[PDB]
Every structure is written in structure tokens, then in C-alpha cells.
Design an enzyme around this catalytic site. Structure first.
Site, PDB file in Angstrom:
ATOM      1  N   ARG A  76       0.831  -1.169   0.000  1.00 45.17           N
ATOM      2  CA  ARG A  76       0.000   0.000   0.000  1.00 45.17           C
ATOM      3  C   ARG A  76       0.881   1.240   0.000  1.00 45.17           C
ATOM      4  O   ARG A  76       1.568   1.497   0.985  1.00 45.17           O
ATOM      5  CB  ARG A  76      -0.819   0.007   1.284  1.00 45.17           C
ATOM      6  CG  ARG A  76      -2.226   0.465   1.090  1.00 45.17           C
ATOM      7  CD  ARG A  76      -2.982   0.748   2.376  1.00 45.17           C
ATOM      8  NE  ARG A  76      -3.519   2.089   2.256  1.00 45.17           N
ATOM      9  CZ  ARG A  76      -3.842   2.901   3.235  1.00 45.17           C
ATOM     10  NH1 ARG A  76      -3.707   2.532   4.504  1.00 45.17           N
ATOM     11  NH2 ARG A  76      -4.322   4.102   2.917  1.00 45.17           N
ATOM     12  N   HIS A 120      -3.608  10.790   0.230  1.00 46.47           N
ATOM     13  CA  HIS A 120      -3.139  10.534   1.598  1.00 46.47           C
ATOM     14  C   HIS A 120      -2.526  11.861   2.128  1.00 46.47           C
ATOM     15  O   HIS A 120      -1.381  11.914   2.633  1.00 46.47           O
ATOM     16  CB  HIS A 120      -2.129   9.350   1.603  1.00 46.47           C
ATOM     17  CG  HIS A 120      -1.996   8.656   2.932  1.00 46.47           C
ATOM     18  ND1 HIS A 120      -2.136   7.286   3.082  1.00 46.47           N
ATOM     19  CD2 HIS A 120      -1.689   9.135   4.156  1.00 46.47           C
ATOM     20  CE1 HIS A 120      -1.928   6.959   4.342  1.00 46.47           C
ATOM     21  NE2 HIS A 120      -1.652   8.060   5.019  1.00 46.47           N
ATOM     22  N   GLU A 165      -8.442   7.940   5.382  1.00 43.85           N
ATOM     23  CA  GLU A 165      -8.939   8.512   6.633  1.00 43.85           C
ATOM     24  C   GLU A 165      -9.564   9.909   6.529  1.00 43.85           C
ATOM     25  O   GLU A 165      -9.039  10.883   7.129  1.00 43.85           O
ATOM     26  CB  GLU A 165      -7.832   8.560   7.671  1.00 43.85           C
ATOM     27  CG  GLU A 165      -7.183   7.208   7.974  1.00 43.85           C
ATOM     28  CD  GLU A 165      -6.129   7.297   9.100  1.00 43.85           C
ATOM     29  OE1 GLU A 165      -5.415   8.328   9.211  1.00 43.85           O
ATOM     30  OE2 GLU A 165      -6.019   6.335   9.888  1.00 43.85           O
ATOM     31  N   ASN A 292      -8.763   0.840   9.416  1.00 44.89           N
ATOM     32  CA  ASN A 292      -7.560   1.001  10.227  1.00 44.89           C
ATOM     33  C   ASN A 292      -7.944   0.821  11.686  1.00 44.89           C
ATOM     34  O   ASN A 292      -9.086   1.097  12.060  1.00 44.89           O
ATOM     35  CB  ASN A 292      -6.981   2.408  10.065  1.00 44.89           C
ATOM     36  CG  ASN A 292      -6.539   2.716   8.645  1.00 44.89           C
ATOM     37  OD1 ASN A 292      -6.290   1.829   7.786  1.00 44.89           O
ATOM     38  ND2 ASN A 292      -6.394   4.010   8.390  1.00 44.89           N
ATOM     39  N   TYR A 294      -5.903   0.899  15.852  1.00 44.96           N
ATOM     40  CA  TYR A 294      -4.712   0.934  16.702  1.00 44.96           C
ATOM     41  C   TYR A 294      -5.037   0.725  18.177  1.00 44.96           C
ATOM     42  O   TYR A 294      -4.237   0.095  18.866  1.00 44.96           O
ATOM     43  CB  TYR A 294      -3.908   2.255  16.587  1.00 44.96           C
ATOM     44  CG  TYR A 294      -3.269   2.503  15.243  1.00 44.96           C
ATOM     45  CD1 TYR A 294      -2.149   1.801  14.875  1.00 44.96           C
ATOM     46  CD2 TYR A 294      -3.801   3.440  14.333  1.00 44.96           C
ATOM     47  CE1 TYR A 294      -1.551   2.001  13.669  1.00 44.96           C
ATOM     48  CE2 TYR A 294      -3.202   3.643  13.070  1.00 44.96           C
ATOM     49  CZ  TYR A 294      -2.062   2.928  12.771  1.00 44.96           C
ATOM     50  OH  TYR A 294      -1.401   3.030  11.570  1.00 44.96           O
ATOM     51  N   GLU A 348      -4.343  -0.691   7.977  1.00 45.41           N
ATOM     52  CA  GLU A 348      -3.378  -0.164   8.913  1.00 45.41           C
ATOM     53  C   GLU A 348      -3.506  -0.903  10.227  1.00 45.41           C
ATOM     54  O   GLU A 348      -4.601  -0.974  10.771  1.00 45.41           O
ATOM     55  CB  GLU A 348      -3.740   1.295   9.294  1.00 45.41           C
ATOM     56  CG  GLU A 348      -3.046   2.417   8.583  1.00 45.41           C
ATOM     57  CD  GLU A 348      -3.147   3.700   9.398  1.00 45.41           C
ATOM     58  OE1 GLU A 348      -3.973   3.810  10.300  1.00 45.41           O
ATOM     59  OE2 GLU A 348      -2.325   4.685   9.136  1.00 45.41           O
TER      60      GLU A 348
HETATM   61  C1  G2F Z   1      -2.706   5.945   9.722  1.00 48.06           C
HETATM   62  O1  G2F Z   1      -2.012   6.099  10.986  1.00 48.06           O
HETATM   63  C2  G2F Z   1      -0.574   6.072  10.840  1.00 48.06           C
HETATM   64  C3  G2F Z   1       0.014   6.103  12.233  1.00 48.06           C
HETATM   65  O2  G2F Z   1      -0.643   7.159  12.957  1.00 48.06           O
HETATM   66  C4  G2F Z   1      -0.143   7.334  10.059  1.00 48.06           C
HETATM   67  O3  G2F Z   1       1.287   7.547  10.041  1.00 48.06           O
HETATM   68  C5  G2F Z   1      -0.757   7.206   8.651  1.00 48.06           C
HETATM   69  O4  G2F Z   1      -0.426   8.254   7.705  1.00 48.06           O
HETATM   70  C6  G2F Z   1      -2.288   7.073   8.748  1.00 48.06           C
HETATM   71  F1  G2F Z   1      -2.672   6.804   7.469  1.00 48.06           F
END
Ligand code: G2F
Length: 442
Positions: A76, A120, A165, A292, A294, A348
Site C-alpha cells: 500500500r 493521503h 482517513e 484502520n 490501533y 493499517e
Molecule cells: C494511519 O495512521 C498512521 C500512524 O498514525 C499514520 O502515520 C498514517 O499516515 C495514517 F494513514
């Protein structure tokens, strides 16, 4: 014990143009808003910028060879809009296309699958001067840019992502002002929500006309939100957060033709007056959803948005983010429940830790392995219960420019020594390499 993934499964790594490339003005590229934002004093930790980054603009072949050597099956990456159209529309910069052409050909030659993010976050500065995401005309500018990418690369690239995002782009860029273009206006921020949807739908429309064998989707950030108490208002504050911060903000319009209910309660005043007229075009059919993930967040009603976070014990990453692996399973299940998209990818997942090179010349990031392993396990689970998860992308291949955090947060499975540009595969990268070869866990 043995967690084997389906036979198609795309094991990937992920980056973004401004975060790795450096050389933002090389070869006739226009300025982006991240170039002007990071060159403004006070915006980015330590004054960091994307001027140099990982110097991928020159070291691209070596980086791809790392992907190859690791046996990773999918990459990606994103395209810098201002390398391709320096003023955002009109003139096309052949040297920009040549840069991405070389990367695409290289990946294919080596049997890696390119997943291209169109946008992005590096908007051409020339478009920000006309309002950027605030201006309804961006749906046309975006459509024109997309068309150029499709015409030039769509013969070889078959997997495409419109927006990375959009919640972040709108709200972090235009309400919190923490990201480019650094604005703090709630009316602009919800106009940008809406325009992001219209530009996404317009690009999908052009894609159907120009890449007839391709697949296109869109990527959203998500947190796992849990209530502080068992009180009503608390469970509700959680339903607000999921609807506002997670995929429903955009998937409710795309699948149902309106914003989610609690979003309208809070934000109808901030949205354009006849926003509903745009909804039928917004429903343009997509091929996949990127999610994504985290971390998780304890939240309670608190008398802006009427919501606050509450700190939990729990282990955290260097970002201060709570490590809650069952979030990735929850969000995978929820997305199937709510909108049932035909394909989902985790676009992600990863962690920042205070990595160091030991005297043995290795990065012993057991903390990241543990993180990756737990979450890959939860994504496996979701697959066993029928979520059509087709792929998984670690953020990131490389330690890189972490936006307003600059170089101080390292997410890579490969360490970058910024003084020399040397790459050091971390233990997490070897570990992940093994997972990909075995097509799953232990
Ligand atoms: C998704 O999160 C990561 C880590 O915060 C960022 O660096 C990316 O650009 C984002 F797409």
C-alpha cells in the site's frame, strides 16, 4: 495454536508519499499543504518536515527489494497529487508519473500487488489557496486528478483507494488544526466531510469508466470505544463516538444515503443547507472498505460533543495509545453487522515503540511482535466468524515522518537511521516475514 488464513490472503505493508519520499519539490513538483504546514513554526514537533524523510524518492528500489526479500505480498503506497499536477489541475508533470511508473513496474516484476491510495493528505498548495476541501469544486478537481491516475496506471494497478482517513483530513485538519491546512472552524470541517464524500463518489464514477477490471474502495480510521460506567448516557456517548469517529460517518452516506443519527443530532447546523441533494450520487457502489485500527478508549458523557476520554491502566504504545487487541475483532464484526461490505481489508495496524539498535546490530522490538501477533489473532477470529477480510497491512514498512509528531514516533518493521538512511529490519519484520510465508500464526 495454528491460525491459518484463507488461500487468497493479501499480507501487506503500508506507507504514504509525504511520510517517506522527501524531495517534495524535485522534478517540477508543486508544493503540498504538508510542505507549507510543516515549514510553519510551531506546527510540527522539533520543527521536523518532509524535506528528507526516508529519502524514498531516491531509495525506492532498495525499499521494494526489502519488501521482496521479506516475501510480503502487497504494498500500500500513496501518490503525491502535486508531483502529478503541480497546480492541482491542468498541467500534468511527466516526471511525477515516471517516478510512480518505475515503482509500479518494479512491484509487478517482483510479484508484489500495488494498492494505490490516491489521496493521503498532500493536497496541492495551489488548491488550498482556492479553499481545498472547503470548496465544493474539489469534487471536480479530485475527479480530474483520479482520471489521470487511472489512465496512466490503471492498466497495471487494479486495487485503488480514493481517500485515506477522511475523518482525520476533515476534523484534524480543519477543526483541531493539528494537521494541514491547520484550521479551526467547525463549519469548514463538516463542509470538508461532505466534500470528501462527493469527491470520493466522483472518483469512483470515473474509475468505472476507465478501469473496467479494477477494484476501488476507501479507508477509515477507527477506535474501539467502551463506556466508563453502565449508565445510559455513557453507553450513548460510546454510540456517538463510533458514529462520529469510526466508519459510519462515511459508510452511512455511502450505503444508506444519510449521515448517522447521532452525527445529525450534534452537527446538522454545521453541514451545508441542502446536503441531502448530494446523497444519491454519494451512494456510488464501492468494491471494498479499508479499516484502520490501533487502540481502545474509555469514554463517558461529560457535560464539546458532550464526551471525554478517561485514562485506563493498560499497557500503552509510545503514542500513549491503549493496547486493546479485541478492538480489531469488534470493528471487523461491527462493519459486517452494520453495512455488510462485500470485501474488507485491514489497511493499517501497528505500533510505535521507542526502538533502539542494540550492540548486536538488531532491533529487539518484542513489544511490537506481541502487538502484531495479538491483533493478527483477533483478525483471524473475525475470519472464522465470516467477515470477508481479504488482507492485512502493517503500518508501516519504514520508520517515517509521523505528521505533527515528526520523526519521533517509529512505526516501522524496518528501522531507519536518519543520519545515514540505513535500513535495519527489526525482529518484528523477521517475525512478520515468517507469518507471511506460513500464511498465518504459530
Ligand atoms: C494511519 O495512521 C498512521 C500512524 O498514525 C499514520 O502515520 C498514517 O499516515 C495514517 F494513514
Amino acid at each position: 495454536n495454528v491460525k491459518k488464513f484463507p488461500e487468497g490472503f493479501l499480507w501487506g505493508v503500508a506507507t504514504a508519499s509525504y511520510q517517506i519520499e522527501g524531495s517534495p519539490l524535485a522534478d517540477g513538483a508543486g508544493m503540498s499543504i504538508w510542505h507549507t504546514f510543516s515549514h510553519t513554526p510551531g506546527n510540527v514537533k522539533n520543527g521536523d518536515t518532509g524535506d528528507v524523510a526516508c529519502d524514498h524518492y531516491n531509495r525506492w528500489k532498495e525499499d521494494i527489494e526489502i519488501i521482496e526479500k521479506l516475501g510480503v505480498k502487497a504494498y500500500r503506497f500513496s501518490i503525491s497529487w502535486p508531483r502529478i499536477l503541480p497546480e492541482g489541475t491542468g498541467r500534468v508533470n511527466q516526471k511525477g508519473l515516471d517516478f510512480y511508473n518505475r515503482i509500479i513496474d518494479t512491484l509487478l516484476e517482483k510479484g508484489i500487488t500495488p494498492f494505490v491510495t490516491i489521496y493521503h493528505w498532500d493536497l496541492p498548495f495551489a488548491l488550498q489557496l482556492k479553499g481545498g476541501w472547503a470548496n465544493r469544486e474539489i469534487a471536480d478537481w479530485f475527479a480530474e486528478y483520479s482520471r489521470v491516475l487511472f489512465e496512466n496506471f490503471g492498466d497495471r494497478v487494479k486495487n485503488w483507494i480514493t481517500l485515506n482517513e477522511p475523518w482525520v483530513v476533515a476534523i484534524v485538519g480543519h477543526l483541531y488544526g493539528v494537521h494541514a491546512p491547520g484550521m479551526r472552524d467547525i463549519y469548514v470541517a463538516f463542509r470538508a466531510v461532505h466534500n470528501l464524500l462527493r469527491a470520493h463518489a466522483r472518483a469512483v464514477k470515473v474509475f468505472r469508466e476507465t478501469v473496467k477490471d479494477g477494484k476501488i474502495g476507501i479507508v477509515f480510521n477507527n477506535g474501539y470505544f467502551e463506556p466508563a460506567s453502565e449508565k445510559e448516557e455513557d453507553i450513548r456517548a460510546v454510540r456517538f463516538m463510533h458514529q462520529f469517529n469510526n466508519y459510519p460517518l462515511f459508510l452511512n452516506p455511502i450505503y444508506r444515503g444519510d449521515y448517522p443519527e447521532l452525527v445529525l443530532e450534534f452537527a446538522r447546523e454545521y453541514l451545508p443547507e441542502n446536503y441531502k441533494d448530494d446523497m444519491s450520487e454519494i451512494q456510488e457502489k464501492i468494491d471494498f472498505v479499508g479499516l484502520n485500527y490501533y487502540s481502545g478508549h474509555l469514554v463517558k458523557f461529560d457535560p464539546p460533543a458532550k464526551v471525554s476520554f478517561v485514562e485506563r491502566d493498560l499497557p500503552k504504545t509510545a503514542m500513549g495509545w491503549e493496547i486493546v487487541p479485541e478492538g480489531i475483532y469488534w470493528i471487523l464484526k461491527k462493519v459486517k453487522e452494520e453495512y455488510n461490505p462485500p470485501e474488507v481489508y485491514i489497511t493499517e495496524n501497528g505500533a510505535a515503540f521507542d526502538d533502539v539498535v542494540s550492540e548486536d546490530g538488531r532491533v529487539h522490538d518484542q513489544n511490537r511482535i506481541d502487538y502484531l501477533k495479538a491483533h493478527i489473532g483477533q483478525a483471524w477470529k473475525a475470519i472464522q466468524e465470516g467477515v470477508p477480510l481479504k488482507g492485512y497491512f502493517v503500518w508501516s514498512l519504514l520508520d517515517n515522518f509521523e505528521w505533527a509528531e515528526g520523526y519521533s514516533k517509529r512505526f516501522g518493521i524496518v528501522y531507519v537511521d536518519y543520519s545515514t538512511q540505513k535500513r535495519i529490519v527489526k525482529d518484528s519484520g523477521y517475525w512478520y516475514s515468517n507469518v507471511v510465508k506460513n500464511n498465518g500464526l504459530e
